[PDB]
Design a protein around this ligand. Structure first.
Ligand SMILES: CS(=O)(=O)Oc1ccc2cncc(NC(=O)Cc3cccc(Cl)c3)c2c1
Ligand SMILES: CS(=O)(=O)Oc1ccc2cncc(NC(=O)Cc3cccc(Cl)c3)c2c1
Ligand SMILES: [Cl-]
Lengths: 296, 305
């Protein structure tokens, strides 16, 4: 029993965190094999990069200084070739996630990991993270089997306190650029398939007060959900929730009618899994994993 | 900016998790130097759990009855002893991944990270608090016994909790790493129930100071309170009494934000009376009590927005 916002064990990622200094700027880098990946804003980026030499980049792994022997840029990520392969390099992949998907963030300062938390890529491509100055270069990841899938690298904070960054190939999530200009997150929406998954997790943990005898149609549900700034629910989402529907005995459009009643009438002083708000940062896969005990 | 429930990086603890098997029971152990620590109920059958005599069950065991597995390697058990509710298995190999560590016993209201494991394999990490009724609201399934709670301030891992059991309400009970239970619990399948739980007042106040640091002040009022009047009101909402120690501990946050502890107590009093009126505080519609004053100072900036 119990339902917590759970992050993946961070050890495989901790053994990759390094400190990258260029002039006055210090941020975090990801050391995989003989390459250190970090935000290019550590340095017209091609014009600024051409003026740099290998010895201008100081890379520190624990108490050891790594020697930079080459450098290149890929989109908004700087790739620093180092003379030493990381002996702690785990099995890994660079993957680009979609909005609604969740991941763990290992927040670092000066190449030293300080905390791990779980979060979701919002529909407006920002993340509601917890980052201070020096956090740049902190990474997002998932673990599937013994393989670390790196999906996010932190680049900046927006004026609303939310965060923006790139995949590990340097492509930003969202219409953001890595510069000091007028940038604002778009109007955000609630991740409907995730709220439904979280409602199924509450039923599994013995919370059924919100269940009712009613069912709905996908069309009627989407007409109602569009009124509350909820993301549209697709047939793919309905298919993905299939296993949880079979385990609890509540059809996806049956649970949608519960969500419709919760949206139109509120919680009436009640909570669901210790929350007075509808939680949208657990995917259907996160719910099945936390209510099954998958290990790494 | 931002405020998340943050856990410590778990790598230093992952390199200590092992699987302990005794007969049909399999659970987690903590391998530090040449000793594996695990719940003593690993020696029990389900029948034995009603009235187990651990001393009688342990005397019938030999070293080779305990199977310890670290990754794909079998460790050889060369000795065994019981200390309170923890079994200490002496092994022939010191853990090369043993971090700098300490065993610390925490008090209610204190927070810690939990590395939830099954079959000696870590599956997840989350942050939680020791409730005033000595239980923890964790997320654990069967096979999670032996998972540990810890804090990592600087380079030293402070082990404070080892998971032993789930109570009827879904909450969890366990021991410090010396085998002493937190709360009036026994490692026995007996009519045991968690006491009525209360809200950790000093933690809610710390979290209200964190909201002010992140630029939110809608909940403040022009009022103050005496400590006695605050406690008379707080007790009616099942909030823990606020002591002078708690007021002293909140001193730094009071100096940083410019809001006296007893003035923050007055906003808390008003929030309990009015609710949030459709508003949130740090993305929450409930008053959060699982961040200590120390957690707030660690996570938040030193400059108030
Ligand atoms: C603004 S500050 O308080 O001085 O420092 C912070 C604070 C929290 C912060 C949290 N995450 C990231 C930060 N850094 C930036 O956004 C730097 C920046 C600027 C322009 C363009 C880019 Cl790509 C990056 C943060 C800075
Ligand atoms: C056997 S079950 O209740 O269906 O599965 C669970 C579920 C969640 C669980 C979460 N933590 C621990 C579990 N196991 C026990 O409590 C074992 C036990 C029993 C009596 C006394 C003691 Cl000291 C220990 C859990 C079992
Ligand atoms: Cl303590």
């Amino acid at each position: 029993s119990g339902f917590r916002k759970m992050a993946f064990p961070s050890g495989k990622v901790e053994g990759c965190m390094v400190q990258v200094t260029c002039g006055t700027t210090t941020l975090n880098g990801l050391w995989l094999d003989d390459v250190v990946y970090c935000p290019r804003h550590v340095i017209n980026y091609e014009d600024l990069l051409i003026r740099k030499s290998n010895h201008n980049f100081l890379v520190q792994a624990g108490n050891v200084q790594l020697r930079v022997i080459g450098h290149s840029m890929q989109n908004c990520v700087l790739k620093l070739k180092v003379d030493t392969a990381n002996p702690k390099t785990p099995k890994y992949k660079f993957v680009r996630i979609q909005p609604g998907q969740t991941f763990s963030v290992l927040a670092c300062y000066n190449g030293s990991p300080s905390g791990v938390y779980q979060c979701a890529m919002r529909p407006n491509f920002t993340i509601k993270g917890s980052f201070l100055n020096g956090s740049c270069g902190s990474v997002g990841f998932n673990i599937d089997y013994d393989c670390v899938s790196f999906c996010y690298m932190h680049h900046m904070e927006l004026p609303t306190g939310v965060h923006a960054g790139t995949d590990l190939e340097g492509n930003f999530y969202g219409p953001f650029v890595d510069r000091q200009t007028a940038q604002a997150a778009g109007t955000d929406t609630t991740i409907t398939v995730n709220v439904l998954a979280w409602l199924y997790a509450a039923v599994i943990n013995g919370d059924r007060w919100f269940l009712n005898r009613f069912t709905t149609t996908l069309n009627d549900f989407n007409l109602v959900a569009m009124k509350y700034n909820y993301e549209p629910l697709t047939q793919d989402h309905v298919d993905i929730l299939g296993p949880l529907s079979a385990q609890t005995g509540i059809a996806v459009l049956d649970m949608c009618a519960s969500l419709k009643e919760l949206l139109q009438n509120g919680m009436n002083g009640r909570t669901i899994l210790g929350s007075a708000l509808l939680e949208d940062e657990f995917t259907p896969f996160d719910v099945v994993r936390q209510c099954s005990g998958v290990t790494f």
